[PDB]
Design a protein around this ligand. Structure first.
Ligand SMILES: NC(=O)C1=CN([C@@H]2O[C@H](COP(=O)(O)OP(=O)(O)OC[C@H]3O[C@@H](n4cnc5c(N)ncnc54)[C@H](O)[C@@H]3O)[C@@H](O)[C@H]2O)C=CC1
Ligand SMILES: Cc1cc2nc3c(=O)[nH]c(=O)nc-3n(C[C@H](O)[C@H](O)[C@H](O)COP(=O)(O)O)c2cc1C
Ligand code: SF4
Ligand code: FES
Lengths: 217, 433, 62
């Protein structure tokens, strides 16, 4: 429905142009490598990755980070603001340690993603789009994540957890807040996009380099 | 017996993506074991004209979803140089709901994609390849980068790729959560550091593309099948499927099926055979089927009566008023609220519209509100016709095809399930005086 | 209120050509000033120039 997030920035004690932000020397080396991937006359093309890098260092993107990215790449700050507000993966507000994203589009909705959403809500005691008091977990609804075959699915900190049941997501949350790393992927003895039982295709061993190459080649 | 008339059963020896399920090593050693990077030097030295001719005689059509003939599109870039560099852009955004094929291609055999990038760049005379991978596919992008690193150390790409004397680079660029960035021009704009807003055509990318240079945007499946087509010949690829519907295809069957999965199958396989053979059949039996969306959210849905004999290719699905799209089959059984499903798709399109042009930006939101009211039943039957007209005012009037992809699902729902909407409005009126 | 004393303050006449207006003014005894018609000059528009490889016409936003 409604987005709920504003696209106007108002200066705040913890979000203002004087908020401290600076890349680390290692991140500066990574930025240099990023910029070296584009033609010499087009350095603005590096806006999308470098901005992402800033978030990967900070967790979110204060207005100071956008200003720093604009200064580094010699791009006007309004262009960086445009990019930061256009793309939904950019966090213009602090989020929890683990960002939980539940796909609710029709393919996942058909396989009961509502049960996963309700189980997460009950386990964490927070509404969608709200961050726990502890701040480790943040929950939001996302569109199709490209894993509709393994549905219902969840993305936590660029990790995919698939074939979820309420118990599966409860255990994932329990071992996430216990300091452990859950195994990403499906949770039905499947571990890929193959059929759940039988392996109807690709059972014979694959063949070698020159199996069916044409003549005169 | 020439001119086969029944399709839908090809054995493993004729399958291109032999590591679809990730049961073998995705690294360089496994790829070479399965026939990847074999005799690429000879193919490169055959020249761009030979490669373009093989792609043309193969009958390969764009696997992104539009089905444009690939040979002609790639030969659009066969002009003499004018000073600007030439580029190949591989589309790996994968935003269409129901579609999961390119993720498996990227993560389980990225070397096929890299070799296809090299072959396509040679055919187009491109200096380098840019792969625009979806920002949410972090592990897949990392696997692709590892494969690219292995190819770079093996001499298969870079300075003097193989022993052909051809210089070629591959770069991976990640998006940040935008479905519209799957459109080729919006993808180019996102690469250049701008918002993912499509640009008008003409000019086409072959004339003015990324950085204002000639470029070709191709789907990852289209790029990845090309080296196999070159090695085995265009005739072998054209032997499968009907005329003008050649080759094999990846299918993602999801929704109300016993075993949702991703498979590789001949093109013109009937939908019922595919569903009951690879997906374990519809949940509750074939008689429990209500509707099928055959080619992703942008294609109109078809009722069970049409799915009994329809074939899974471009022409047959066009004659069924539904299109093939990305070959992402979404199955809805008789327990499905079809209105709620279509309204959820319209909500997805409302959240994915880039907002550039008036018809999409305003009308998609308008149809979202109308469908939300349709779900409850607040509306009156006349509004249905109004909704139809509204969709007609969006389709064919926008910059890009996202407006069409939002207009078509409501058109299908109205075409095939109008009595459901009417009876919902009747029940709402009778319940609320 | 705004008061005037001249009766021609609202008189505006329409003519098809400049020569017609000149003839009317001359036959009515009025001395006149003629200004030549200003027509906007044709311009060269190119949507592709928004994305130039090496020119300054490439736009930073859309
Ligand atoms: N793979 C995915 O995740 C998604 C796929 N789609 C599919 O995208 C399809 C529509 O996309 P469009 O690009 O707008 O279709 P299109 O027909 O306008 O273009 C398809 C390709 O053909 C080229 N082309 C077409 N006409 C040309 C000409 N006269 N000269 C030079 N080149 C030409 C274009 O450059 C383009 O690359 C839809 O059918 C949809 O199924 C939509 C959303 C997501
Ligand atoms: C809104 C929209 C989103 C799209 N997203 C993708 C995508 O994610 N991946 C893709 O391969 N094509 C996508 N397409 C279709 C592209 O135009 C297509 O990739 C491009 O034409 C490549 O052509 P090909 O299929 O011949 O390789 C999208 C089209 C539209 C209108
Ligand atoms: S149709 Fe929608 S997504 Fe496409 S350019 Fe117009 S507003 Fe943007
Ligand atoms: S619909 Fe959920 S991953 Fe695509």
């Amino acid at each position: 429905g409604a987005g709920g997030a504003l696209f106007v920035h108002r200066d705040t004690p913890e979000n203002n142009p004087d908020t401290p932000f600076d890349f680390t020397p290692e991140n500066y080396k990574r930025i240099e490598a990023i910029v070296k991937n584009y033609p010499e006359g087009h350095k603005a093309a590096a806006v999308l990755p470098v901005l992402d890098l800033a978030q990967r260092q900070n967790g979110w993107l204060p207005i100071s980070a956008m200003n720093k990215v604009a200064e580094i790449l010699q791009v006007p700050p309004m262009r960086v603001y445009e990019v930061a507000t256009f793309y939904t993966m950019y966090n213009r507000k602090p989020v929890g340690k683990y960002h939980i994203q539940v796909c609710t589009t029709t393919p996942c909705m058909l396989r009961n993603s509502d049960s996963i959403l309700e189980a997460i809500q009950k386990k964490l005691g927070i509404k969608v789009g709200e961050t726990t008091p502890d701040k480790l977990f943040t929950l939001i609804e996302v569109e199709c994540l490209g894993a509709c075959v393994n549905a219902p699915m969840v993305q936590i900190n660029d990790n995919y957890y698939e074939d979820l049941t309420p118990k599966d997501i409860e255990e994932i949350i329990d071992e996430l807040k216990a300091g452990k790393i859950p195994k990403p992927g499906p949770r039905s003895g499947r571990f890929s996009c193959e059929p759940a039982g039988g392996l109807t295709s690709l059972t014979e061993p694959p063949k070698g380099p020159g199996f069916g190459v044409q003549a005169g080649l | 017996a020439p001119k086969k008339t029944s399709f839908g059963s090809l054995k493993d020896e004729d399958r291109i993506f032999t590591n679809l399920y990730g049961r073998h090593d995705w690294r360089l050693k496994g790829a070479q074991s399965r026939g990847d990077w074999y005799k690429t030097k000879e193919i490169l030295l055959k020249g761009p004209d030979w490669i373009l001719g093989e792609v043309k005689t193969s009958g390969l059509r764009g696997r992104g979803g539009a089905g444009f003939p690939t040979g002609l599109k790639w030969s659009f870039m066969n002009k003499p140089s004018d000073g600007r560099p030439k580029y190949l852009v591989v589309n790996a955004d994968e935003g269409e709901p129901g579609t999961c094929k390119d993720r498996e291609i990227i993560r389980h055999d990225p070397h096929k994609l890299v070799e296809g990038c090299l072959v396509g760049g040679r055919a187009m005379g491109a200096r380098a390849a840019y792969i625009y991978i979806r920002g949410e596919f972090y592990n897949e992008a990392s696997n692709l980068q590892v494969a690219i690193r292995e190819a770079y150390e093996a001499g298969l790409i870079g300075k003097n790729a193989c022993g052909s004397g051809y210089d070629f680079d591959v770069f991976v660029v990640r998006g940040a959560g935008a479905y519209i960035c799957g459109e080729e021009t919006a993808l180019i704009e996102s690469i250049e550091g701008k918002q993912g807003k499509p640009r008008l055509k003409p000019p086409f990318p072959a004339d003015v593309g990324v950085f204002g240079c000639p470029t070709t945007v191709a789907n990852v499946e289209t790029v990845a099948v090309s080296p196999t087509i070159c090695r085995r010949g265009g005739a072998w690829f054209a032997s499968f499927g009907r005329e003008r519907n050649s080759g094999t295809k990846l299918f993602n069957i999801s929704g109300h099926v016993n075993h949702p999965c991703t498979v590789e199958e001949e093109m013109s396989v009937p939908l019922k055979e595919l569903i009951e053979k690879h997906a374990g059949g519809v949940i509750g039996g074939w008689d429990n089927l209500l509707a099928v969306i055959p080619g992703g959210s942008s294609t109109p849905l078809i009722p069970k009566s049409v799915c009994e004999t329809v074939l899974m290719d471009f022409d047959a699905l066009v004659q069924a008023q539904t299109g093939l799209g990305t070959a992402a089959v979404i199955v809805m059984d008789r327990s499905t609220d079809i209105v709620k499903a279509i309204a959820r798709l319209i909500e997805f399109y409302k959240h994915e519209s880039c907002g550039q042009c008036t018809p999409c930006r305003e009308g998609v939101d308008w149809m979202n509100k109308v469908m939300a009211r349709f779900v409850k039943g607040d509306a009156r039957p006349a509004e249905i016709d109004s909704l139809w007209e509204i969709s007609k005012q969006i389709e064919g009037h926008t910059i890009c095809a996202l407006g069409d992809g939002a207009a078509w699902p409501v058109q299908g729902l109205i075409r095939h399930f109008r009595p459901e909407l009417e009876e919902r409005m009747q029940q709402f009126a009778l319940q609320h005086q | 209120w705004s008061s005037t004393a001249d009766p021609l303050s609202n008189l505006v006449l329409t003519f098809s050509t400049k020569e017609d207006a000149v003839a009317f003014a001359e036959k009515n005894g009025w001395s006149f000033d003629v200004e030549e018609r200003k027509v906007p000059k044709p311009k060269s528009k190119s949507y592709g120039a928004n994305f130039s490889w090496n020119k300054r016409t490439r736009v930073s936003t859309k």
